[PDB]
């Protein structure tokens, strides 16, 4: 559904952002959090969405679409506008409908969020998930309108499969390149570059890791290799941040610094 239509899609025409516009909108949240702490919070919530999706037995594509909705929401709005703890299952619930997986039942979605946060994220959350289905339904309306009803999202997985098939290196490179594409969701890359460019950067890093010579295959590409190197530098930087970051020791403090929604008068 809409495969091949990237250059005429709302993902490309509206949701491929200018890095400076993104950094400018982030300044309102950077009054409470450092750039490093804001990045760590985005890593954290990508891992929460991943865990919610795994618990609900959702395919990686559903999880990826939900992650992009979450990033698109907080690219334009502050962390205080809507609680990201409510936004994360709401993104999963809507993506599952768009990806034609189905409507996750009220009890199943609420039990999965309560269960995932309790058993996998209690280092960051001391209290049980407080939201009910009416909150998710309310949030869904807000998320839909604040994304300008743009639901079709393109991911690097499909172009990656086409690239490794062309390379004739599926058995050796696909598992690692696919995992590296999973890792790119811990960064802002999906908001800044077309998916095929993120797939090429991941495939390039996989070749370097597995010491596979693919310079000629990469040179024969009609692509801007400067943008590919920009993406590669973001991936290498994520690995250094990943190494130095202990999410379990730091997230309860980072979540406390995060701007909270202001209650009504």
């Amino acid at each position: 559904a809409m495969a091949g239509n990237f250059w005429q899609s709302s993902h490309y025409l509206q949701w491929i952002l200018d890095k400076q516009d993104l950094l400018k909108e982030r300044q309102k949240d950077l009054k409470f959090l450092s750039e490093e702490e804001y990045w760590k919070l985005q890593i954290f919530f990508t891992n929460v969405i991943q865990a919610l999706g795994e618990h609900l037995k959702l395919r990686q594509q559903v999880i990826a679409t939900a992650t992009v909705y979450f990033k698109r929401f907080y690219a334009r709005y502050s962390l205080k506008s809507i609680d990201p703890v409510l936004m994360a299952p709401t993104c999963v619930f809507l993506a599952s409908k768009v990806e034609e997986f189905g409507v996750v039942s009220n009890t199943r979605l609420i039990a999965a969020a309560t269960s995932v946060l309790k058993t996998r994220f209690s280092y960051a959350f001391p209290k049980e998930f407080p939201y009910r289905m009416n909150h998710i339904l309310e949030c869904e309306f807000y998320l839909l309108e604040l994304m300008d009803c743009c639901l079709i999202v393109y991911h690097p997985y499909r172009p990656l499969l086409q690239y490794v098939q062309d390379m004739g290196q599926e058995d050796m490179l696909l598992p690692l390149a696919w995992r590296i594409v999973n890792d790119t969701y811990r960064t802002d890359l999906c908001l800044l570059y077309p998916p095929f460019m993120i797939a090429l950067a991941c495939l390039h890093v996989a070749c370097v890791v597995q010491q596979k010579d693919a310079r000629q295959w990469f040179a024969e590409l009609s692509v801007d290799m400067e943008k590919i190197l920009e993406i590669i530098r973001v991936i290498l930087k994520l690995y250094e941040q990943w190494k130095n970051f202990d999410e379990r020791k730091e997230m309860a403090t980072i979540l406390s610094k995060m701007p909270k929604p202001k209650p009504p008068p």
């Binding site: 495969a3 091949g4 709302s10 205080k80 409908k97 768009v98 309306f141 079709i152």
Partner: protein, 335 residues
Amino acid sequence: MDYDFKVKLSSERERVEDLFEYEGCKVGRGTYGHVYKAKRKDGKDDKDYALKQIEGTGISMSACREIALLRELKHPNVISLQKVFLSHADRKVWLLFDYAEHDLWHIIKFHRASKANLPRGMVKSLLYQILDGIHYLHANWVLHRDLKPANILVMGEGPERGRVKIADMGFARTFWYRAPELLLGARHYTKAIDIWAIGCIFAELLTSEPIFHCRQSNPYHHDQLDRIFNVMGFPADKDWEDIKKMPEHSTLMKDFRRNTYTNCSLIKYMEKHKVKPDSKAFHLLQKLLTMDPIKRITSEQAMQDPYFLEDPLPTSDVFAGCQIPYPKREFLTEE
């Protein structure tokens, strides 16, 4: 939710009841919801609009597919989504489009009622435009899944006079337009299923009668298949090899005998309705109405058919400058 964020959004939120005048102007009611002929209240346009309140509250699978797909699709023969209004109090979703005064259900009903009591290339142009819009959907891996005369809109007077607009992408997943593989338990929708529906519509445009007209949970439907065999004949093993693979094939063998439909064929059917079997129109209809889906023509191959090169050529305006004799749509008094 942040209070300042909430009141700002509520202040900036465009409400359908404040932007459009539509009460009493319902023209459609079905599983899609409610369709109204609306006007702008601010009066900066004199255009007619089509406003749809999607069926049910929230974002159902149906509403989700319709919004997700129409938000991306851009083709002259596919209805264009202008705006989405999300009514927070009642959780209702409204979709805005241009208003198409006509649809094939009404145009066909007008010709059918006349025979009881078209310009040269109108039918050809309608078929070419349906094929063009379906080919665009299929090239983008979008199946319609429910093509019927009612969701094939045609613009009335204005800048897009006589332009077909394919409507209703909300079929998220009578049977007169259902391909026989669906009636035999096919587990998935395919491009071929849409092509069969286009073939039913084409035949109905030529004769004014639904070709597979039939009386009113299980995918298997006896009378509908019986009507298809009465028109097309019973498929031989060579005509549809993979018919054995259909989940209801043994039910088809138990309930049906080939010899019952021995003098039945599309040729004989179309002959009764005064359509010449030696015409390019007939040969194209037969390629669309092929029982075996893997043997059905593609929408792109149909657009390349020599029928579209034969006089008269298809026109952008299906009415070809002619006075539209079709009446305007009537307003339903929905209560």
